[PDB]
């Protein structure tokens, strides 16, 4: 019941920024968190950031802590990954999934159709 958007995604150049959003239908269930995750190919995927819908509180995967930012717009039921000095290892569909817990993957039951990021040599 939950429809999921993201936008944002493309080509850009390695040391540089890029910010994705999600749009959301609905509120996440069973658990309130909302999170971006990431698959490359040949790989498991990923959890990147998290956060309560609650209360706000944010999670990150240590592959991209202190370069990314996760953040919402209550009014807009959006939230958005800002996502800094990026390097062509962060190169990935990036998903906005809700209604989880942090970033296990296997508790969201609703998932975008993923934006892809591509990040140059
Ligand atoms: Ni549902």
């Not at 910010?19 to 040949?42: E, I, K, T």
């Not at 939230?79 to 190169?91: A, G, I």
Request: with cysteine; net charge neutral.
């Amino acid at each position: 019941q939950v429809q999921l958007v993201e936008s944002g995604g493309g080509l850009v150049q390695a040391g540089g920024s890029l910010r994705l959003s999600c749009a959301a239908s609905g509120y996440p269930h069973p658990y309130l968190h909302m999170g971006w995750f990431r698959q490359a190919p040949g790989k498991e995927r990923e959890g990147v950031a998290a956060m309560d819908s609650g209360g706000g509180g944010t999670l990150y995967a240590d592959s991209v802590k202190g370069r990314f930012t996760i953040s919402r717009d209550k009014g807009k039921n959006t939230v958005y990954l800002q996502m800094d000095s990026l390097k062509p290892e962060d190169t990935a569909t990036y998903y906005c999934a809700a209604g989880g817990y942090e970033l296990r993957d296997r508790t969201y039951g609703h998932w975008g159709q993923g934006t892809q990021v591509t990040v140059s040599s």
